[PDB]
Amino acid sequence: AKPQPIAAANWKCNGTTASIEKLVQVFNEHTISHDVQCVVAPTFVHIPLVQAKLRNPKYVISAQNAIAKSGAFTGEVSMPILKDIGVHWVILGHSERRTYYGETDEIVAQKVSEACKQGFMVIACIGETLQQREANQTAKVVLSQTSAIAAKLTKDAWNQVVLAYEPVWAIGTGKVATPEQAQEVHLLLRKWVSENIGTDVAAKLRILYGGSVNAANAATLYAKPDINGFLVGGASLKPEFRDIIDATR
Amino acid sequence: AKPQPIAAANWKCNGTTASIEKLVQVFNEHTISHDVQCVVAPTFVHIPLVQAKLRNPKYVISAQNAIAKSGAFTGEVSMPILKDIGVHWVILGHSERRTYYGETDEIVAQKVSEACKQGFMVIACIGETLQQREANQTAKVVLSQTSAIAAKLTKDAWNQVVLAYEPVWAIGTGKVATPEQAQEVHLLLRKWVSENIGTDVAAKLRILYGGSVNAANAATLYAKPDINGFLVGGASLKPEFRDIIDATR
Ligand SMILES: *C[C@H](O)COP(=O)(O)O
Ligand SMILES: *C[C@H](O)COP(=O)(O)O
């Protein structure tokens, strides 16, 4: 009795208007016949184009990042600005931003909290590095990341949260986690949520896997009992995202 | 024989589609009767709206930031993506990004270089802090910032560069630099450019002032011989930006 799956396309910093037009038509022409929330997260400047072209009723549009408040923050996009333009999903804490762009656990947690307060659905990203994995620290790391987020949330806010477990060593590298690796982590995360947040919350929570998901490995990942779908980078730029969606059947 | 002035609106992280519609109509209905490049820099998600609504022929649209290359940079917008959507102006190195968002001199210089290579007009921001000012380090600081940028540029690339001198203590604080303060810095910057880059380059270079510019203080700033216009934050969200433009006559 899994909760509704999610298939989320993180386009990252990629696209042209011609390429996006073509890919959106692919997405539109793919009839989805099961209950799944599809998400596409274009770059900020592409949000209006995607809003204008995307019509598949299974989809919503997400931002790839945000800051909490409007103001004197040259170059950034705030949560109120996104809400006003009709975007009410956001990806927060992607490894890329934790690594390159200074986002500590505290900063990610604050952003997630603020997003929930503003009515967003949030895909909050967590995951260990290769060195953490090899040091047998996977569980400690993902639980610390999750706990940091949880410390700024009320119980009710969790209804807006989606966790995305993405081992850093699997992101963009062609080294997907095995089904067993992912399931082990999703199980421990769900147990933590059950015990620390609530048993109801844990049963409803979507915990997505990401890191080198493709159309050929997705269904076997999805067969694991605590995997609720995917956060997809490279493969989401391609027509084979259709089969990743259908791997959540 | 000043070069063509620039009046640039840095909206920062502000706007709604309703507020932007209204302000763009104000800008459109203001007939400008002198040679000036007006620039408006909306948030990324607002670029398409501004592109659709802005018609005043004196204007171009700028990004408030960018990264050099497309790829696995969740949340960021690249220079090729901006070029493809029709944006070929960018503000780089704003204090807000140097201060909050990790942009060192090296990072700013690299971004400016890459933007010039990709055909952008670049508004490159420099300026000292209050503590640097009080330590008599203003000239050392702005010349170091400018030199860092220059080290990554060819002579020809300077035709695409605009400098914006914004003392950090003047940004958003209601403490504008005096005309004499700004002119002293613009003079020393232009002399450095003349001697280190070329006398032709220096004569053509626009050096803008920013930091608490408003419609009432702009004309007296513009009267100074080495001030070529303005990078405007708060006042650019208001109808009085019209009079800031006209203060460059
Ligand atoms: C959530 C991570 O973005 C996935 O990137 P991948 O290219 O799918 O590895
Ligand atoms: C270039 C600086 O953005 C200007 O901000 P101000 O609000 O005009 O001080």
Side-chain angles (χ1 to χ4, degrees):
Chain A
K2 283 187 171 174
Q4 177 196 56
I6 296 165
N10 180 7
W11 285 351
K12 308 184 183 183
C13 186
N14 294 284
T16 59
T17 60
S19 72
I20 289 169
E21 281 189 332
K22 287 183 182 297
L23 188 59
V24 169
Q25 177 172 5
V26 172
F27 296 176
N28 283 340
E29 288 181 4
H30 173 222
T31 303
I32 299 158
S33 68
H34 69 293
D35 187 15
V36 52
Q37 181 65 75
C38 297
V39 182
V40 59
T43 80
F44 293 126
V45 80
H46 293 140
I47 282 171
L49 176 60
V50 177
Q51 289 176 311
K53 299 305 185 183
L54 183 63
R55 293 292 179 279
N56 188 312
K58 297 296 191 187
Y59 285 70
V60 291
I61 299 165
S62 184
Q64 287 178 25
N65 182 43
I67 64 171
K69 294 281 82 200
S70 298
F73 310 114
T74 296
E76 299 294 316
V77 177
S78 68
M79 289 170 195
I81 285 175
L82 289 167
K83 285 299 299 300
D84 172 80
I85 211 168
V87 174
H88 57 93
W89 281 65
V90 63
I91 300 168
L92 293 170
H94 196 277
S95 180
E96 293 151 14
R97 302 211 62 82
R98 292 177 178 266
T99 301
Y100 302 153
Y101 313 122
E103 299 193 0
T104 61
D105 288 326
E106 176 73 21
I107 287 164
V108 175
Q110 189 72 42
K111 289 187 174 192
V112 172
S113 185
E114 292 286 354
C116 287
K117 288 171 187 174
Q118 294 180 51
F120 285 75
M121 299 296 312
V122 177
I123 302 169
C125 301
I126 62 179
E128 85 290 356
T129 64
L130 187 59
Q131 177 62 262
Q132 290 164 341
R133 168 80 41 176
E134 297 299 78
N136 254 30
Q137 292 169 346
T138 299
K140 171 184 86 30
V141 169
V142 298
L143 294 181
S144 177
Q145 295 175 322
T146 299
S147 189
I149 290 160
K152 303 190 190 292
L153 296 181
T154 57
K155 183 177 184 175
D156 281 353
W158 281 84
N159 216 56
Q160 288 160 245
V161 172
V162 172
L163 298 182
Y165 170 55
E166 310 191 295
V168 177
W169 52 260
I171 299 173
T173 60
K175 294 161 287 201
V176 71
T178 72
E180 293 72 28
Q181 285 177 313
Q183 171 60 25
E184 169 184 82
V185 171
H186 290 222
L187 185 76
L188 75 85
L189 283 166
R190 197 180 305 278
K191 177 171 187 211
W192 185 96
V193 173
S194 191
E195 290 185 348
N196 292 81
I197 314 299
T199 59
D200 53 341
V201 171
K204 291 53 163 214
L205 177 63
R206 281 75 69 86
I207 311 178
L208 313 184
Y209 171 75
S212 302
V213 176
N214 69 36
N217 64 32
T220 301
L221 280 154
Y222 193 74
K224 294 291 186 180
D226 291 273
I227 301 183
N228 308 120
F230 304 109
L231 185 59
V232 185
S236 79
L237 293 167
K238 299 177 92 179
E240 289 69 47
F241 189 68
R242 297 176 292 178
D243 265 305
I244 298 173
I245 296 163
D246 286 345
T248 69
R249 296 178 281 206
Chain B
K2 283 187 171 174
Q4 177 196 56
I6 296 165
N10 180 7
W11 285 351
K12 308 184 183 183
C13 186
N14 294 284
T16 59
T17 60
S19 72
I20 289 169
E21 281 189 332
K22 287 183 182 297
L23 188 59
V24 169
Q25 177 172 5
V26 172
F27 296 176
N28 283 340
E29 288 181 4
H30 173 222
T31 303
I32 299 158
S33 68
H34 69 293
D35 187 15
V36 52
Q37 181 65 75
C38 297
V39 182
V40 59
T43 80
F44 293 126
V45 80
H46 293 140
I47 282 171
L49 176 60
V50 177
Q51 289 176 311
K53 299 305 185 183
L54 183 63
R55 293 292 179 279
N56 188 312
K58 297 296 191 187
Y59 285 70
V60 291
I61 299 165
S62 184
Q64 287 178 25
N65 182 43
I67 64 171
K69 294 281 82 200
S70 298
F73 310 114
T74 296
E76 299 294 316
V77 177
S78 68
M79 289 170 195
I81 285 175
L82 289 167
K83 285 299 299 300
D84 172 80
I85 211 168
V87 174
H88 57 93
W89 281 65
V90 63
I91 300 168
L92 293 170
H94 196 277
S95 180
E96 293 151 14
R97 302 211 62 82
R98 292 177 178 266
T99 301
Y100 302 153
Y101 313 122
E103 299 193 0
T104 61
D105 288 326
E106 176 73 21
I107 287 164
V108 175
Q110 189 72 42
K111 289 187 174 192
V112 172
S113 185
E114 292 286 354
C116 287
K117 288 171 187 174
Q118 294 180 51
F120 285 75
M121 299 296 312
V122 177
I123 302 169
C125 301
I126 62 179
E128 85 290 356
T129 64
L130 187 59
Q131 177 62 262
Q132 290 164 341
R133 168 80 41 176
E134 297 299 78
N136 254 30
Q137 292 169 346
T138 299
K140 171 184 86 30
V141 169
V142 298
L143 294 181
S144 177
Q145 295 175 322
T146 299
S147 189
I149 290 160
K152 303 190 190 292
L153 296 181
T154 57
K155 183 177 184 175
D156 281 353
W158 281 84
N159 216 56
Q160 288 160 245
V161 172
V162 172
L163 298 182
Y165 170 55
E166 310 191 295
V168 177
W169 52 260
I171 299 173
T173 60
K175 294 161 287 201
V176 71
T178 72
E180 293 72 28
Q181 285 177 313
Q183 171 60 25
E184 169 184 82
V185 171
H186 290 222
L187 185 76
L188 75 85
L189 283 166
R190 197 180 305 278
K191 177 171 187 211
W192 185 96
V193 173
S194 191
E195 290 185 348
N196 292 81
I197 314 299
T199 59
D200 53 341
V201 171
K204 291 53 163 214
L205 177 63
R206 281 75 69 86
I207 311 178
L208 313 184
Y209 171 75
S212 302
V213 176
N214 69 36
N217 64 32
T220 301
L221 280 154
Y222 193 74
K224 294 291 186 180
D226 291 273
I227 301 183
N228 308 120
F230 304 109
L231 185 59
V232 185
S236 79
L237 293 167
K238 299 177 92 179
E240 289 69 47
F241 189 68
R242 297 176 292 178
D243 265 305
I244 298 173
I245 296 163
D246 286 345
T248 69
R249 296 178 281 206

